[PDB]
């Protein structure tokens, strides 16, 4: 992962039980913007019809 | 499912997937190898007299 | 638009007959049976039924009295 | 809670019950005995000082612990 400037303090309970509260400067830069690649198949079978 | 006092250097004590099967999925330690006959074997430094 | 029903369960006890009475009343207001007796707060018919239960102006007895009244109003419109 | 915290409470229970079992085994209270309760031999007063209320000698104590190793 990537290192990012954390600070330990409750702050209105948007991290109540075990939660995290990421600030939009983390989401703008694309520094967790991770990439996923899929393999969609579309076969063409040989029906009796 | 448990750790026995001879895992020291042959199986990670703190790596095993918690949940259904803990301890059954031990991870081979860092420096450790497989013996000739097949056992696990770790390194040590031979100490002479002192 | 209503956090609880606790006034309703006070008025018409048993907390289950409440559910049944309110459901019947709601089918009346939703399917074209009737219209509400409490000023609607643009709420769905469920809340309006619980509320009319809350005022002591719907219950099992009153609903059966109106069943009787509409059954007898029809036989004088069938002739 | 979490799958770690439950494990913490269980481990604390396990070590607590162990430690209390081994504090209960040590006597540290009783009346002086002056002689073995099995063979009649004398308990030397140094050993009695180490444990107030030693019902056994060291010989009989070792013997009893040694039979009890086989857990019978």
């Amino acid at each position: 992962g990537q290192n990012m400037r954390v600070a330990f303090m409750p702050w209105n309970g948007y991290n109540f039980e075990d939660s995290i509260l990421v600030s939009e400067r983390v989401v703008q830069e694309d520094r967790f913007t991770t990439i996923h690649i899929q393999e969609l198949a579309c076969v063409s079978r040989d029906t009796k019809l | 499912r448990d750790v026995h006092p001879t895992h020291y250097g042959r199986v990670c004590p703190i790596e095993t997937p918690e949940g259904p099967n803990i301890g059954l999925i031990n991870s081979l330690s860092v420096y450790a190898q497989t013996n000739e006959y097949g056992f696990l074997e770790t390194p040590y430094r031979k100490v002479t007299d002192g | 638009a209503r956090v609880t029903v606790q006034d309703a369960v006070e008025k018409i006890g048993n907390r289950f007959d409440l559910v049944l009475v309110a459901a019947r009343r709601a089918r009346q207001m939703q399917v074209g049976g009737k219209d509400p007796l409490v000023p609607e707060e643009n709420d769905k018919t469920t809340v309006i039924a619980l509320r009319e239960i809350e005022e002591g102006l719907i219950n099992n007895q009153i609903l059966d009295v109106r069943e009787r009244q509409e059954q007898q109003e029809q036989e004088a419109a069938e002739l | 809670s979490d799958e770690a915290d439950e494990a913490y409470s269980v481990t604390e229970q396990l070590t607590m019950t162990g430690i209390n079992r081994i504090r209960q085994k040590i006597n540290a209270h009783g009346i002086p005995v002056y002689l073995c309760e099995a063979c009649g031999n004398p308990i030397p007063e140094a050993r009695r000082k180490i444990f107030p209320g030693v019902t056994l000698c060291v010989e009989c104590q070792a013997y009893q612990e040694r039979q009890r190793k086989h857990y019978a």
Binding site: Q2, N3, A7, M9, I20 | - | - | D5
Partner: protein, 248 residues
């Protein structure tokens, strides 16, 4: 950036992350000092004395670097790859003893306590009692939300038992198992349960009559009888067992 929860450390003995936060804070301290020394661009002698201070640093180690061997056009490269923050190491059970971290924070200019006064960002007034800060290294486990999310209004259906069986992201209902039924029996909820396992789920006429009624804006449910129990009659009867339904 991230604002974790302090109530998670004392309950879980993993004070490791707090030591890591302080050490990372100090490491970015070295990084920003190099950043200023490079961006106010000084001369390679300044960077040599400073980075060479950052690598010697006190207690005995197995690391000594001797930056008087690098050329100028290497120490400049080295500084540029360090300006983001001086990567500190810590072999596992031979870690950074806390005095070493306090000194590596003094080498920066952070507060040796490890904590900073944080001004709130909405009310603009100082959070009492200086909070922790620092750079924690945070992964991203692949339990992403848009792989777990799922919702099924009316998908495909199984073949032997007419139950919801959809595929895509198990494109079917949630397993409304047994203990949930004990829950819904514990309430007085009887109609919700009934439409939970007669209309919504199995009864292959009840479900389409339900759907037609929903689209017509008439929330009833003409339930009928499940399909699973019907299969159970046909099986229990395939044996030599006359199962019936008395009619009265």
């Amino acid at each position: 950036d991230i604002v974790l929860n302090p109530l998670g450390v004392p309950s879980r003995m993993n004070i490791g992350q707090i030591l890591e936060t302080h050490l990372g804070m100090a490491a970015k301290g070295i990084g920003d000092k190099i950043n200023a020394m490079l961006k106010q661009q000084q001369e390679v002698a300044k960077l040599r004395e400073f980075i060479q201070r950052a690598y010697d640093l006190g207690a005995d180690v197995r690391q000594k670097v001797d930056l008087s061997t690098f050329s100028d056009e290497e120490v400049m490269r080295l500084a540029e790859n360090l300006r983001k923050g001086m990567p500190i190491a810590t072999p596992v059970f031979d870690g950074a003893k806390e005095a070493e971290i306090k000194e590596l924070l003094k080498l920066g200019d952070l507060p040796t306590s490890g904590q900073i006064r944080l001004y709130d960002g909405r009310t603009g007034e100082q959070f009492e009692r200086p909070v922790t800060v620092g750079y924690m290294y945070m992964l991203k486990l692949n339990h992403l939300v848009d792989d777990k999310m799922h919702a099924r209004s009316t998908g495909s259906y199984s073949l032997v038992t007419q139950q919801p069986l959809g595929g895509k992201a198990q494109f079917g209902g949630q397993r409304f198992g047994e203990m949930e039924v004990w829950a819904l029996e514990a309430y007085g909820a009887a109609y919700t349960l009934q439409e939970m396992l007669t209309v919504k789920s199995d009864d292959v006429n009840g479900r389409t009559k339900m759907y037609k009624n929903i689209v017509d804006g008439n929330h009833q449910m003409e339930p009928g009888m499940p399909e699973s129990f019907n299969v159970l009659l046909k099986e229990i009867r395939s044996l030599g067992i006359n199962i019936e339904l008395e009619d009265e």
